[PDB]
Paper text:
Pfs28 is a Plasmodium falciparum malaria transmission-blocking vaccine candidate that is anchored to the parasite surface through a C-terminal glycosylphosphatidylinositol (GPI) moiety, and plays a role in parasite survival in the mosquito midgut. Pfs28 contains epidermal growth factor (EGF)-like domains and is part of a family of sexual stage malaria proteins that includes the related vaccine antigen Pfs25. Pfs28 is a glycosylphosphatidylinositol-anchored protein expressed on the surface of zygotes and ookinetes and plays a similar role as Pfs25 in ookinete survival and traversal through the midgut. Pfs28 is a GPI-anchored protein, consisting of an N-terminal signal sequence, four EGF-like domains, and a C-terminal hydrophobic sequence that is the site of GPI attachment.
The construct used for crystallography consisted of V1-S173, comprising only the four EGF-like domains. The crystal structure of Pfs28 was solved to a resolution of 2.3 Å. The Pfs28 structure is comprised of four EGF-like domains in a triangular arrangement, with sides of 40 Å and 50 Å and a thickness of ~ 20 Å, with the overall structure stabilized by 10 disulfide bridges. EGF domains 1–3 adopt the characteristic structure, consisting of a major two-stranded β-sheet followed by a loop and a shorter two-stranded β-sheet, while only a single two-stranded β-sheet in EGF4 was observed. EGF domains 1 and 4 each have two disulfide bridges, while EGF domains 2 and 3 contain three disulfide bridges. Due to flexibility and a lack of clear density at the C-terminus of the protein, the C-terminal portion of EGF4 (residues S157-S173) could not be modelled. The major difference between the structures of the two antigens lies in the lack of the third disulfide bridge in EGF4 of Pfs28. This is reflected in the greater degree of disorder present in EGF4 of Pfs28 compared to Pfs25, such that its C-terminal region could not be resolved in the crystal structure. The residues shown to stabilize the triangular arrangement of the EGF domains in Pfs25 are conserved in Pfs28: Q14, M15, S16, H18, E20, K98, S112, C113, T131 and L135. However, the crystal packing of Pfs28 did not adopt a similar tile-like pattern and we also saw no evidence of interaction between Pfs25 and Pfs28 as measured by BLI.
Numbering used by the authors: -1 to 155
């Protein structure tokens, strides 16, 4: 199973889309897993290899028959680039319309689309249908569900 209403996001907070929950990271952090974030690290040392450097990305160093550092921010294993951002392999060059491609929690072998609020998912797994999903987050004390762009999130009053 992926992110649910009771999922705890390490160094991140819960957001709600039309048909799924997701974890979004605190300032200065990026996603390692669906529910885990780590500090965004600058890839400028071999000592920093495999540290978080972007969403689903970690620092990677190449020894191209060299002694110099050849380091870049690379998609973690089981992830690949799509539209300039690392995505799950099941999301390789997949489109969602008004939504975000994710791993399908009901079947890890396929992808699905987490649709922006105001759009629901069509039977072809495209976010191109107009529907309004109510907010189902459990917000903390002195907090209220707030629509921030494409996703609901709990915000302070």
């Amino acid at each position: 199973t992926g992110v649910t209403e009771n999922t705890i996001c390490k160094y991140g907070y819960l957001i709600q889309m039309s048909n799924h929950y997701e974890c979004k990271c605190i300032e200065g952090y990026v996603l390692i897993n669906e529910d885990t974030c780590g500090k965004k690290v600058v890839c400028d040392k071999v000592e920093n290899s495999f540290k978080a450097c972007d969403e689903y990305a970690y620092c990677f160093d190449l020894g191209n028959k060299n002694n110099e550092k050849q380091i870049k921010c690379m998609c973690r294993t089981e992830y690949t680039l799509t539209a300039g951002v690392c995505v799950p392999n099941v999301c390789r060059d997949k489109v969602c319309g008004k939504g975000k491609c994710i791993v399908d929690p009901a079947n890890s072998l396929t992808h699905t689309c987490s649709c922006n609020i105001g759009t629901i998912l069509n039977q072809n797994k495209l976010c191109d249908i107009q529907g309004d999903t109510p907010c189902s987050l459990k917000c903390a004390e002195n907090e209220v569900c707030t629509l921030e762009g494409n996703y609901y999130t709990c915000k302070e009053d």
